[PDB]
Design a protein around this nucleic acid. Structure first.
Lengths: 152, 62, 134, 107, 91, 84, 220
RNA sequence: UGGACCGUCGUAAGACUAACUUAAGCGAAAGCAUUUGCCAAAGAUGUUUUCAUUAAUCAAGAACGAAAGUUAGAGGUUCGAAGGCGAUCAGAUACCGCCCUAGUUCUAACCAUAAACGAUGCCAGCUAGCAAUUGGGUGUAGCUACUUUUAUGGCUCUCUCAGUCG
């Protein structure tokens, strides 16, 4: 509550300790519960796994893109959009990408992302239609005003 | 611009206001160039003629 | 034995271009990057109509032949451009006349081709379905 | 005031078919009812042929010609004297005549 | 009888908000909270929770999908797009 | 003659090339033949335009060629134009 | 700006071009390259040069008749103003192209891409034509959309025999005589009479690496 | 002004799928052209298959109809009503140019009209040739092809139905 997007609750068995360790992804599309996710450079491409860019070709779409390899996914995750890559380059390990802006820019390649479109769209095409729902649309996202103009 | 061109064969004109004999002439040192030139005024067959422009003849098909 | 003659035997490219309303004499490298003697008929007669004349094409063909010999070029190749897409696709009247002053200058040349742009399929002319009503 | 029998060209069991524009007017017309002259025209216009034989690198290179199927509309035909004005009866043949010489503009 | 004449399920929200804004929620709420054939449970037991988060009520499989239909036509196209492409990389 | 007096008695061979249907009576060009496949010996009767794969009970050599017309077997057949 | 008072072509120097070894001799002329500087390095501008030559220049065609096989070449590296000038394609001119299509026909077009013994990815453009049988007054000699599409399938398995077919050190020698243009008739004539037929263009879109060890053997 | 237009490789980018194109064909009509796979459906000959009149056409009526053109959501190349500007003209608000704007684009639908024309509704029968050509059959007492004389295959002739053109 505060998103529009749905989350994804998932856990793992540690390569080092004895316990389970619970994490929270952003929902790839078609994620049934009980799906077997995979996270690795050797992990083959199937939605919605998480794999680095150097092992998928162009033409695929992804979500939860990471720019700086380690900072775990700060790009293009919100509802109804899709992280894309349309360029590979084996010179100094480069792969250009198109954000949902349309302005296409360059990222490094060793970083990770989750393959496929991300769930939630499209919550602009249903008009909220009254001043009670778009109260609650800003009940728990921020506290803007139901905003008040300038010229009075 | 100093070559002289002798006539071999004659054809008609787009005459009315400037009758100019579209006419088949060849040179002497350049006698292999039988370029079909356009002389203004009456010309008998067998006349060598001077010339300065020795490039083209503004061809229209006839 | 295997003795090729000195005097810098080379085959340049003409890239002779002609059209209605212009003729272009654009000689370059055989690879095609470096360009020598770009000058054409558009810098010959100041009339804004007579730059389609074969006379101006001849003056565009008078000058370009001798500057090949200033660097020792004695031979070249000849390409043709239309440059029609949905446009003309057929060479202008000054096209065939332009090679004559090249031919009547004792320049030994054999290669005659067109790179006249034949598209895969048309991409729309200008004028729109009732074009150019004279 | 119907004069042609079938009409234009080639509309047997189809309806309405592919157009492409004319070159010298580009009144965009269907591919059947537009005059379609096809020409293999020569490069030097048969006059510089004696000049290129002297300037050839090889034995005359022997000269190619151009190939492009041009497409004319109706007033383009009549405003260049392509095909015009037979009788009320002399519009009833297609296949003849030339009868005299190997046709020019090729040449 | 044919109870209303056009509007159907937005008839709660009547005489309000406009003409072609009463219609635009029709075309997006005759799909939402109708029942769907579950791809796993086989039956027709699909209602919503919030945006894009459907569950069944039978056999407890829950699947994330589209937000006004069960899964969009944008989505399975991608599920078809990564399908044909996956056999090209390692093979 | 276009204004002919005899239609009851036409010439035979032109009727043989007229049609399978438009004759004075109705009988097709088709018949039955008794094919022996050349690698075997067994007797089998089959239609001309059989439109169906036939083999014997134990002699499945060729016996047919799949087509829309008559079963055109080249050098793999032996039969007769005869009611058996 | 620069303001050179005389002869920009003075710095443009005569640089020779050298063929590969297997065709013929290597001197097919010169190129004009600007003289280098410390930051302006003229050797690395030769890599941006795409070069053109015909088989008449590389198989001593005195009367130009087989000159329709026009070869694209790529200048890749130099030594002592002598470029190695690797292959970059082999197209057809428009002269031999447009002369074939006398309307009255059904062409046989086929496009196929494949990977070689080496790391190249060629693009083969199989273009066929129908041969008129004798004693025939019918002015069509047409193919009936299975008489092409099976013939279209007939060439695509032929060409992949030659993509694993001893590449550019040996492959273009099979394209010099065009033995691939010979044997396809004997397969096509089992279905349909085949007229003139060519490949008309090849493409070199995945030249993988320089590989100078066999390439100095190619410059042998 | 110094780098257009030009030559050249290269990156995208969206539209179009020319040539081959026909007095071709498929479709009920509008319309309908890259390959190849897929998923279908129809027509024609083939048929000593089955069925037993299941029929023809049709008010009311239900599917389908290029644009033009609207309703939100994409994506932007050529082009482009409208709008500005140069000429031309007596005037041009136009015929010609330059720029882009609606939009053509593909997805979701919505009107349903066109000279939507072969200015001729559909189904049964007869009456005339001649010549093309599409498919399917059939006869070569045909050649050609070499896998071999063959074989499948091509063309030619003969016959044939549906024709459609002339």
């Amino acid at each position: 509550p505060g998103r529009g997007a749905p989350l994804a609750v998932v856990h793992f068995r540690d390569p080092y300790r004895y316990k389970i360790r619970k994490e929270l992804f952003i929902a790839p599309e078609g994620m049934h519960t009980g799906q077997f996710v995979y996270c690795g450079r050797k992990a083959t491409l199937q939605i919605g796994n998480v794999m680095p860019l150097s092992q998928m070709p162009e033409g695929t779409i992804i979500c939860n893109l990471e720019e700086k390899t380690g900072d775990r996914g700060r790009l293009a995750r919100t509802s109804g959009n899709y992280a894309t890559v349309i360029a590979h380059n084996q010179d100094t390990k480069k792969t250009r990408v198109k954000l949902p802006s349309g302005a296409k820019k360059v990222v490094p390649s060793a970083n990770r992302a989750m393959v496929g479109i991300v769930a939630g769209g499209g919550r602009i095409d249903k008009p909220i239609l009254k001043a009670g729902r778009a109260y609650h649309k800003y009940k728990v996202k921020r506290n803007s005003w139901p905003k008040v103009r300038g010229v009075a | 611009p100093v070559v002289w061109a002798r006539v071999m064969k004659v054809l008609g004109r787009t005459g009315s206001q400037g009758q100019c004999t579209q006419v088949k002439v060849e040179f002497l040192g350049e006698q292999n160039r039988q370029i079909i030139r356009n002389v203004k005024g009456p010309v008998r067959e067998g006349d060598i003629l001077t010339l300065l422009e020795s490039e083209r003849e503004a061809r229209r098909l006839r | 034995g295997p003795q090729v003659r000195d005097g810098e035997i080379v085959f340049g490219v003409a890239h002779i271009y002609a059209s209605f309303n212009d003729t272009f004499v654009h000689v370059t490298d055989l690879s095609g990057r470096e360009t020598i003697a770009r000058v054409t008929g558009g810098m010959k007669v100041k009339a804004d109509r007579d730059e389609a004349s074969p006379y101006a094409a001849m003056l565009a063909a008078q000058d370009v032949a001798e500057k090949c010999k200033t660097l020792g070029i004695t031979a070249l190749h000849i390409k043709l451009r239309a440059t029609g897409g949905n446009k003309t696709k057929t060479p202008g009247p000054g096209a065939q006349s332009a090679l004559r002053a090249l031919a009547r200058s004792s320049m030994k040349i054999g290669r005659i081709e067109d790179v006249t742009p034949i598209p895969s399929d048309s991409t729309r002319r200008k004028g729109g379905r009732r074009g150019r009503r004279l | 005031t119907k004069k042609r029998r079938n009409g234009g060209r080639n509309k047997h069991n189809r309806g309405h078919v592919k157009p492409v524009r004319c070159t010298n007017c580009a009144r965009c017309v269907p591919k059947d009812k537009a005059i379609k002259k096809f020409v293999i025209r020569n490069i030097v216009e048969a006059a510089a042929v004696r000049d290129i034989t002297e300037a050839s690198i090889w034995d005359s290179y022997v000269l190619p010609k151009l190939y492009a199927k041009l497409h004319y509309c109706v007033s383009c035909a009549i405003h260049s004297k392509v095909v015009r004005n037979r009788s009320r009866e002399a519009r009833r043949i297609r296949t003849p005549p030339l009868r005299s010489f190997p046709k020019d503009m090729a040449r | 009888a044919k109870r209303t004449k056009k509007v159907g399920i937005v008839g709660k929200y009547g005489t309000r908000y406009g003409a072609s804004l009463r219609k635009m929620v029709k075309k997006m709420e005759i799909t939402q909270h109708s029942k769907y054939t579950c791809s796993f449970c086989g039956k027709d037991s699909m209602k919503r929770a919030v945006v894009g988060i459907w569950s069944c009520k039978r056999c407890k499989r829950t699947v994330a999908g589209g937000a006004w239909v069960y899964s969009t036509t944008a989505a399975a196209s991608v599920r078809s797009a990564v399908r044909r492409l996956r056999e090209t990389k390692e093979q | 003659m276009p204004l002919a007096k005899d239609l009851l008695h036409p010439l035979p061979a032109e009727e043989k090339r007229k049609h399978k249907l438009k004759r004075l009576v109705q009988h097709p060009n088709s018949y039955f033949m008794d094919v022996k496949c050349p690698g075997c010996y067994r007797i089998t009767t089959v239609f001309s335009h059989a439109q169906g794969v036939v083999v014997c009970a134990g002699c499945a050599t060729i016996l047919c060629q799949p087509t829309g017309g008559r079963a055109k077997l080249t050098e793999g057949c032996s039969f007769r134009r005869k009611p058996q | 700006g620069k303001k050179k008072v005389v002869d920009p072509f003075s710095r443009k120097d005569w640089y020779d071009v050298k063929a590969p070894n297997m065709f013929q001799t290597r001197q097919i002329g010169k190129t004009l390259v600007n003289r280098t500087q410390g930051q302006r390095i003229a050797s690395d501008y030769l890599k941006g040069r795409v070069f053109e030559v015909s088989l008449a220049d590389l198989q001593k065609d005195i009367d130009p008749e087989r000159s329709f096989r026009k070869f694209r070449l790529i200048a890749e590296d130099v030594q002592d103003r002598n470029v190695l000038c690797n292959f970059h394609g082999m197209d057809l001119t428009t002269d031999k192209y447009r002369s074939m299509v006398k309307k009255w026909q059904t062409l046989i077009e086929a496009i196929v891409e494949a990977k070689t013994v080496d790391g190249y990815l060629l693009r083969v453009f199989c273009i066929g034509f129908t041969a008129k049988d004798q004693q025939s007054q019918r002015k069509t000699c047409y193919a009936q959309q299975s008489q092409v599409r099976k013939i279209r399938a007939r060439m695509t398995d032929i060409i992949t025999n030659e993509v694993s077919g001893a590449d550019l050190k040996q492959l273009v020698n099979k394209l010099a005589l065009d033995s691939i243009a010979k044997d396809i008739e004997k397969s096509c004539q089992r279905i349909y009479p085949l007229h003139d037929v060519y490949i008309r263009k090849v493409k070199v879109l995945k030249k993988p690496r320089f590989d100078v060890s066999k390439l100095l053997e190619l410059h042998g």
